[PDB]
Amino acid sequence: NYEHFKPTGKSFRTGLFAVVLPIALYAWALKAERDGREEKYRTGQVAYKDRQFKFI
Amino acid sequence: MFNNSSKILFITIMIIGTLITVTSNSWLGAWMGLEINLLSFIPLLSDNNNLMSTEASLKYFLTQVLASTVLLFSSILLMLKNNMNNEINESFTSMIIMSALLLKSGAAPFHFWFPNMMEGLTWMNALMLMTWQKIAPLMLISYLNIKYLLLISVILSVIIGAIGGLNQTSLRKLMAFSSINHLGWMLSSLMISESIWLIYFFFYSFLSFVLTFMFNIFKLFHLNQLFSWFVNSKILKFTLFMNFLSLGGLPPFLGFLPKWLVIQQLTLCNQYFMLTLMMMSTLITLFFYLRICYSAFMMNYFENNWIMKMNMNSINYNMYMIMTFFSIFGLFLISLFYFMF
Amino acid sequence: HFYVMLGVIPVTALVLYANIFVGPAQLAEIPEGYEPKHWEYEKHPISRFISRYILNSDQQNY
Amino acid sequence: SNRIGDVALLLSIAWMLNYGSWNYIFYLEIMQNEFEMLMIGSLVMLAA
Amino acid sequence: LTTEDFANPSPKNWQSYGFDYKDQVEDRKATKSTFFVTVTLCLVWGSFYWAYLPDTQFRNWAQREGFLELRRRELAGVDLVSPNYVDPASITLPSDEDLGDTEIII
Amino acid sequence: CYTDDAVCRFEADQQFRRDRMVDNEIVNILRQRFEDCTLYEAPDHMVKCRPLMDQYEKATENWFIKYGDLGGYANAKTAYMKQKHRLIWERRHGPVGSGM
Amino acid sequence: SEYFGGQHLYQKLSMYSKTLFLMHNNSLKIYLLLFVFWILILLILLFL
Amino acid sequence: VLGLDKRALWGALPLLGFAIGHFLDKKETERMTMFRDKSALYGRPAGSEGKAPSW
Amino acid sequence: SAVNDPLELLTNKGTHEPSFLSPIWNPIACGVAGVGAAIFINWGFRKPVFSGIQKHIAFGAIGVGAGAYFDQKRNEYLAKRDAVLRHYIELHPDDFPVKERKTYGQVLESWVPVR
Amino acid sequence: MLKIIFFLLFLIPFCFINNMYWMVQIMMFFISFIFLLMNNFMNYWSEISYFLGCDMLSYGLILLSLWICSLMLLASEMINKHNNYKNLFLLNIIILLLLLILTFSSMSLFMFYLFFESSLIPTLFLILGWGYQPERLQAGLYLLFYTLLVSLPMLIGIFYVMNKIGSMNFYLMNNFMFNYDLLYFCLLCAFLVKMPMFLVHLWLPKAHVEAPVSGSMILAGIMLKLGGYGMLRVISFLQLMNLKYSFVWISISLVGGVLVSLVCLRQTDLKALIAYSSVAHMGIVLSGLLTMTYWGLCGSYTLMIAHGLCSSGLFCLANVSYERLGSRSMLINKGLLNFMPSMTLWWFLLSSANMAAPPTLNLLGEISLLNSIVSWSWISMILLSFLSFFSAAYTLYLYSFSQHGKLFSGVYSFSSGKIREYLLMLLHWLPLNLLILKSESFMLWL
Ligand SMILES: CCCCCCCCCCCCCC
Ligand SMILES: CCCCCCCCCCCCCC
Ligand SMILES: CCCCCCCCCCCC
Ligand SMILES: CCCCCCCC
């Protein structure tokens, strides 16, 4: 099928809002949540007994 | 060599002139050795029953005579300014010496004579052109400590010798473009370690000297002559075509070892970017090696019907299969070697 | 089913012979003057046979 | 319609490990006022 | 063909098993030996060998040592899990002037 | 252990792994003690099992203080660096969870 | 992904090899003139 | 019922290779005899070297 | 050893016993390579594989002799290499000094926690 | 592992003796039997002899590779009856088994790299020699170049690590740690392409559809596990750069596996749908590796072994129906229950194994790899639930549309199932349901 594919703004828009854009927002959400939780964890705002996911 | 004892005499004066060149402690003795080597190599490569061999000899003559006169010119200028045989600090006349040596060696961007002349040759004179005639200019490059000009030559040689070999379906010009690509790996090793260059040159000449014998015996001057080449067992053609994966640098063959020692010595000397540029180059060289390897890896071919028996020389095919064994199972001799310590 | 039974029947005979006729080991305290061997840390006689004869010790690998 | 329940049970198992054993019957009455255990119960409720 | 052929089938006409389609003798050896070296050896005798494997990974010994360390630590005032890797008197504790600006990670 | 020594880092890493295993069935045995308290005191597990739950929570807190956040590749070096950084933090900034 | 990958890389390398094959279609005097120009460049900077 | 015919006599050569590999493993066990009893976890102190080695 | 002296690091005390394959691996591998090369020659000329055993015996003897000779040359090359390294360390003791061994009890590295 | 390697090295001359195909299969299953009796390995490196040794990780990977190659000889009978270079095929299988054992038994990383690149050549030989379509040349070139383009700068990374540390041994390299971005990208991108990330998968369905079953099983069952075992070795000393740069790979490998799972719902080729099924579950493996939790590594190794077994078993079924129906698709192979009723039991027992099957090792690998992703962040819950829901949406469509409904009514008469095929399907499924009784040998490699 690839030999009938041309760079067109419809195909670029399909490849943008289909694949790249959910990857971008999902990576941004993961980075923002982990940065906030890492700042909370490294500042010292939570204790060792009141901490989620102790693997125990 | 073939059909005359005077060609054996020309080979003797060829070895004498090259060994006069590389042993010279002055640029003038190296220059006159290049004159002896040129004198020896004009009559081999000349044949009056071939219309293109004389044109190839003329192209070689004009390229080497222009490159030898520039080499003597900048040698005389180096003696004029810095009166010893070498130079204390690097200047432009050392770059002119290196450029005149790069025209002899066939590296890019002075590469253009080399595959345009290799269409006019046989296979044995091709092997003498791209192995022994690269002894004398490459060993004289070692006396010059220039990094930018050598680095430009390395990058241009590995870019062009990979890209340029895709278009030609003739095996002589394709193998000439492969020799341009393997010249860049030699020149990249020339400014880190002369011994590692000698090892890459010896194994490259070994793989060239075993790939010439498959083409010289059966007279394979084209890509589809490989597809029409008759063997009495298709497993034999499958094994004989593994030397192209060896020359492509694929482990566990023998030709992974010299590329690997160049990569190890380059990374110890803290060069990483041009090494990465030479990683992308050798994939394209392995790609146009695989178009030869189409002729044996599919195990069954629509072949021509009239030919039924294959013919070969006795001593040439006996010496060919000693080295084809060592071009496949040559990594079992990794414990025997002691140069690399 | 033939080859499963042809496997299981000597396995069942060996397991019954080990569990009935040679028996398991009994736990006991280590004597002060005795250094135990590498197969004496295991309860079952099949495990003792496997550790003593077939498998290497943990000390040798360590 | 059963696979949604299967993956809700998978996420409940993934949350249940804060206190070690997935045998919930020894922890439900202890942790009826814990946010992680209500989220376990919500995933189990979605699966059921 | 007739109904007497089907009622009394021929030994020489054999439905071939999956291994060899040339000789009937080669199937009746390959099926037996391939079922011996896979089902009997690897999946029954190998599973019996694995069932009575020793504690190569220390798990039963770790359970026994867990009961013994809970036996000794409940006898004394030492807590059941030690919070520290070593004793804090062996910790050198470099001063704040010696550290300067160094990243401290918890 | 020294920096360049590898014969003793193996022994220290192996005893660190074995102590991690020993503390793992310490916490596992304490959890089974709490569960057996729950089954045996079937209508009255809110009174009898509260001290056992207190020892289990203290054991989980001490286990996370010693072994927590090290990851899959927990050497004896990594737990010692964790303990040094934790003792530095309780020297300077006070106990973990108070602030600063 | 095939536009940023293997098939379009093959098309680009085939176009570059077709262009570089036209570089080799001239006589030897063009390349020797290029070498003479490069030597003249290195000799002008010897004055400078 | 086994299915090994007269061509199964070729299989003594891989068992010979098994014996060769086992002999080389035993020779490498003999080569690694340093720290046989000097390890801090399984090694008895001095004055008790008269007993047999453990492996 | 409380210090890492390069002289004590490079001097062969003799506690490293060589392996079983250490004196014998190169001649048997080169003999196997010679026998396989003669087999490969006989296969490409459409002979039987074990037809000419004179070539097999000659190639094996050439392989064993070359393997033993180049193994000896390798051993003297490595001995001279370590002698060169030792003599260069004793020639310039200022650039290769005696460094004090520093335990982990005096080192504060940065541990990397996952969470 | 000298006894196994010398066993296969003297199993090499059985290829040149005629009518010995099943004898090589019998002795390779004997190798698997002996390697079942060699289990005594723990965490560190045991059975050390001439740079060769294994831990529990490498023990399970060698055992999986030995089981897959013996099954591969059992799977490939079309080589035997047509005499389609069975000696060369047997020699390729034995040499590739030596190379995979040698790249798994490596105590230093450079033997792993060297035999890892050596293992690309007999797989390329299998692709270029024993396929059935004209796009064999498109397949092995994609495999070779997508592996080599990222595996060549990792050699520069290896020599950079060697100069910095001075050795390639996996325990001595565990002590150090590096804060270089390009070293991280070299040591990761080769494993990120070799086991398929969503952005770099391309070579996988091209290599799988074209490849012969003895050539698709070694790409599905193993040789994607080289790119997982490489990260299981490499992420130990690059933890800080992994915490800097994990989130882009976790986001890509969790969006893929949903997009990849939606791809399989819109495809008709039977071999291509399992080819994309290898991407989605090892998307879970790749997401669980780069979270450095202990459960993540243990469940990742479990899902590597179990997913290799079930994917090789699923590619076993796609060649049984291919050789009877001439060409495979969803449209031709619709409803094979009325043709082969006894094959349908293995069809469901291995297609259910591709999703969460209840007593198999696939579920136990999946139930502990979800633990690390959920404990990593709560944002990942949304794109995991869609991932597993669409995973069992596509992998039940395979069995559903191929094994139920009206017949094609255009097919000709073909042979029925044989003793070889049911035995081949049994040894892919019952190891998935029997190694759960000792799952600690496939969970705990640490
Ligand atoms: C004195 C007690 C003897 C017990 C013997 C038990 C033998 C068990 C053998 C297990 C391994 C079998 C491998 C085929
Ligand atoms: C085909 C067999 C070749 C090898 C024969 C044995 C050679 C032994 C090594 C060479 C002699 C070493 C003396 C120290
Ligand atoms: C056809 C006869 C096969 C058995 C005799 C020849 C092979 C002997 C091998 C001996 C290995 C030790
Ligand atoms: C590779 C070695 C083969 C010969 C071993 C002999 C042992 C006595």
B50: left (phi over 0), alpha (psi -120 to 50) or beta: beta
Nearest to J97 by CA among J64, J130, J127: J64
DSSP 8-state symbol, J446: -
Closest-CA residue in chain I for E89? Answer: I105
Residue H16 Cβ inside 6 Å of ligand 3? The answer reads yes
CB neighbours of residue B181 within 10 Å:
25
In sequence order, what are the residues at sequence separation of 6 or more whose Cβ sits closer than 8 angstroms to the Cβ of residue F54? none
The full DSSP string for B281-298 is HHHHHHHHHHHHHHHHHS
Give the span between the Cα atoms of J122 and J214, in whole angstroms: 11
Contact G2 A7 (CB under 8 A): no
Closest-CA residue in chain A for F60? Answer: A56
Q: Are the beta carbons of J119 and J229 closer than 8 angstroms? A: no
Give the span between the Cα atoms of B325 and B316, in whole angstroms: 15
- Taking CA atoms only, the protein residue closest to ligand 4 atom 8 is H20
User: B residues 177-196 near G, CB within 8 Å?
Assistant: none
CB neighbours of residue B198 within 10 Å:
16
Pocket test for ligand 3, best of H4, H10, H13 (most atoms within 8 A of CB): H10
Closest-CA residue in chain E for A42? Answer: E106
Strands (E), chain B: none
Q: Are the beta carbons of B254 and B207 closer than 8 angstroms? A: yes
Give the span between the Cα atoms of B304 and B84, in whole angstroms: 65
Q: Is J292 at the interface with chain I, CB within 8 A?
A: yes
Give the span between the Cα atoms of F82 and F51, in whole angstroms: 30
- Taking CA atoms only, the protein residue closest to ligand 2 atom 12 is I24
Q: Is J239 at the interface with chain E, CB within 8 A?
A: no
- Taking CA atoms only, the protein residue closest to ligand 4 atom 3 is H20
Nearest to B97 by CA among B133, B71, B135: B71
Q: Are the beta carbons of J303 and J365 closer than 8 angstroms? A: yes
**Whole-number Cα distances in Å, B127 to B131, B315, J167:** 6, 18, 40
Residue H16 Cβ inside 6 Å of ligand 4? The answer reads no
J264, two tokens: 């399989």
Give the span between the Cα atoms of J438 and D18, in whole angstroms: 25
- In the structure, do chain C and chain E come into contact, i.e. share 3 or more CB pairs under 8 Å? yes
The full DSSP string for E35-85 is HIIIIIIIIIIHHHHHHT---SS-SHHHHHHHHHHHHHHHHSSS-SS-SSS
DSSP 8-state symbol, J133: S
Distance of CA B267 to the CA centre of its chain: 24
Domain boundaries along the sequence of chain B: 1-341
Give the span between the Cα atoms of J207 and J205, in whole angstroms: 5
Q: Are the beta carbons of J290 and J250 closer than 8 angstroms? A: yes
Which residue among I25, I26, I40 places its CB closest to the CB of B321? Answer: I40
CB pairs under 8 A between H and I: 11
CB neighbours of residue I33 within 10 Å:
22
CB neighbours of residue B174 within 10 Å:
22
**What φ, ψ does residue J108 adopt, rounded to 5°?**
-110, 155
Nearest to E100 by CA among F92, I101, A41: F92
Give the span between the Cα atoms of J5 and J111, in whole angstroms: 15
Give the span between the Cα atoms of G43 and G24, in whole angstroms: 27
Angle at B89 between CA B85 and CA B91, to 5 degrees: 90
Give the span between the Cα atoms of J16 and J21, in whole angstroms: 10
Contact G1 J146 (CB under 8 A): no
Nearest to J109 by CA among J231, J21, J273, J239: J231
- In the structure, do chain B and chain I come into contact, i.e. share 3 or more CB pairs under 8 Å? yes
CB neighbours of residue J341 within 10 Å:
11
In sequence order, what are the residues at sequence separation of 6 or more whose Cβ sits closer than 8 angstroms to the Cβ of residue B285? B161, B162, B165, B178, B181, B248
Give the span between the Cα atoms of E9 and E81, in whole angstroms: 77
Kind of pairing between the strands at I3-4 and I99-100:
antiparallel
In terms of DSSP H, where are the helices of C1-62?
2-17, 45-49, 58-61
Closest-CA residue in chain J for C50? Answer: J37
Helix or strand (DSSP H, E) at H44 = none
- In angstroms, the separation between the Cα of residue G32 and the nearest Cα of chain A is 42
Strands (E), chain I: 3-4, 99-100
Give the span between the Cα atoms of J169 and J106, in whole angstroms: 9
- CA atoms within a 13 Å half-sphere pointing along the CA-CB vector of F11: 13
In sign, the C-alpha dihedral spanning I85, I88, I89, I94 is negative
Q: Are the beta carbons of F78 and F72 closer than 8 angstroms? A: no
**Whole-number Cα distances in Å, E99 to B233, E93, E95, I100, I112:** 75, 10, 6, 21, 18
3-class SS string, J267-328: CCCHHHHHHHHHHHHHHHHHHHHCCCCHHHHHHHHHHHHHHHHHHHHHHHHHHHHHHHHCCC
- In angstroms, the separation between the Cα of residue I115 and the nearest Cα of chain E is 11
Q: Is E56 at the interface with chain C, CB within 8 A?
A: yes
Best of H4, H13, H31, H39 to substitute, by most chain J Cβ atoms within 10 angstroms, is H13
Resolution (A): 3.4
Closest-CA residue in chain I for B334? Answer: I26
B222: left (phi over 0), alpha (psi -120 to 50) or beta: beta
J223: left (phi over 0), alpha (psi -120 to 50) or beta: left
Contact J25 E17 (CB under 8 A): no
One-letter amino acid at J55 equals D
F53, two tokens: 């739950």
Contact F64 A51 (CB under 8 A): yes
Distance of CA J415 to the CA centre of its chain: 30
**Whole-number Cα distances in Å, J303 to C9, J216, J358:** 34, 19, 14
**What φ, ψ does residue I64 adopt, rounded to 5°?**
-65, -40
* Cross-strand pairs, I4: I99
- CA atoms within a 13 Å half-sphere pointing along the CA-CB vector of B243: 25
Q: Are the beta carbons of J303 and J276 closer than 8 angstroms? A: no
Give the span between the Cα atoms of J218 and J260, in whole angstroms: 21
Helix or strand (DSSP H, E) at H1 = none
Contact E90 I105 (CB under 8 A): yes
Contact C62 H55 (CB under 8 A): no
Q: Are the beta carbons of F35 and D26 closer than 8 angstroms? A: yes
**What φ, ψ does residue J75 adopt, rounded to 5°?**
-70, -35
Nearest ligand to the CA atom of C24 = 1
Give the span between the Cα atoms of A36 and A49, in whole angstroms: 20
Distance between Cα H10 and ligand 3 center (Å): 5
- Tell me the CA end-to-end span of chain B in Å, nearest whole number: 37
Q: Is H39 helix (H, G, I), strand (E, B) or coil?
A: coil
Residue H23 Cβ inside 6 Å of ligand 4? The answer reads yes
Q: Which chains touch B (3 or more CB pairs under 8 A)?
A: G, I, J
Give the span between the Cα atoms of J92 and B143, in whole angstroms: 48
Q: Which chains touch A (3 or more CB pairs under 8 A)?
A: D, E, F, G, I, J
Give the span between the Cα atoms of J343 and J360, in whole angstroms: 19
Q: Is D20 helix (H, G, I), strand (E, B) or coil?
A: coil
Pocket test for ligand 2, best of I24, I59, I70 (most atoms within 8 A of CB): I24
**Whole-number Cα distances in Å, F31 to B163, D22, E71, F28:** 67, 12, 15, 5
Distance of CA C54 to the CA centre of its chain: 11
For residue I21, which atom of ligand 4 is closest to its CA?
2
Give the span between the Cα atoms of B71 and F38, in whole angstroms: 96
Give the span between the Cα atoms of E94 and B132, in whole angstroms: 66
Q: Are the beta carbons of B160 and B111 closer than 8 angstroms? A: yes
Nearest to C57 by CA among J56, J46, J45, J438: J46
- Cβ contacts of J292 on chain F, cutoff 8 Å: 71-73
CB neighbours of residue E89 within 10 Å:
6
Residue H18 Cβ inside 6 Å of ligand 4? The answer reads no
Give the span between the Cα atoms of B141 and B149, in whole angstroms: 11
- In angstroms, the separation between the Cα of residue J170 and the nearest Cα of chain B is 20
Domain boundaries along the sequence of chain H: 1-55
Give the span between the Cα atoms of B183 and J157, in whole angstroms: 24
In sequence order, what are the residues at sequence separation of 6 or more whose Cβ sits closer than 8 angstroms to the Cβ of residue I25? B335
Contact J255 A23 (CB under 8 A): yes
Helix or strand (DSSP H, E) at I62 = helix I53-91
Environment class of C2 (CB within 10 Å of its CB; exposed 0-12, middle 13-18, buried 19+): exposed
Residue H8 Cβ inside 6 Å of ligand 3? The answer reads no
Contact H40 F11 (CB under 8 A): yes
Give the span between the Cα atoms of I94 and H54, in whole angstroms: 47
In sequence order, what are the residues at sequence separation of 6 or more whose Cβ sits closer than 8 angstroms to the Cβ of residue E58? F18, F21, J42
Give the span between the Cα atoms of A15 and G2, in whole angstroms: 12
In sequence order, what are the residues at sequence separation of 6 or more whose Cβ sits closer than 8 angstroms to the Cβ of residue J189? J150, J153, J154
Spell out a b/e string for H7-27, using b for 16 or more CB atoms within 10 Å of the CB, else e.
eeeebeebeebbebbeebbee
The full DSSP string for F80-92 is HHHHHHHHHHHHH
Distance of CA E30 to the CA centre of its chain: 29
Q: Is J436 helix (H, G, I), strand (E, B) or coil?
A: coil
Pocket test for ligand 1, best of C12, C14, C17, C44 (most atoms within 8 A of CB): C14
Q: Are the beta carbons of J330 and J401 closer than 8 angstroms? A: yes
- Taking CA atoms only, the protein residue closest to ligand 3 atom 8 is H10
Contact H28 I20 (CB under 8 A): yes
One-letter amino acid at F52 equals L
- In the structure, do chain J and chain E come into contact, i.e. share 3 or more CB pairs under 8 Å? yes
- Cβ contacts of G2 on chain A, cutoff 8 Å: 2, 5
Closest-CA residue in chain C for J39? Answer: C55
**What φ, ψ does residue B109 adopt, rounded to 5°?**
-90, 10
Pocket test for ligand 3, best of H4, H6, H7, H9 (most atoms within 8 A of CB): H9
Nearest to C55 by CA among J156, J59, J89, J341: J59
Omega into H53 within 30° of 0, i.e. cis?
A: no
Q: Are the beta carbons of B103 and B110 closer than 8 angstroms? A: yes
- Ligand 1 site: residues with CB under 6 angstroms? C 14, 18, 22, 45-46, 49-50; E 45, 49
Nearest to J203 by CA among J115, J104, J127, J96: J127
Angle at J248 between CA J242 and CA J254, to 5 degrees: 110
Give the span between the Cα atoms of J13 and J397, in whole angstroms: 45
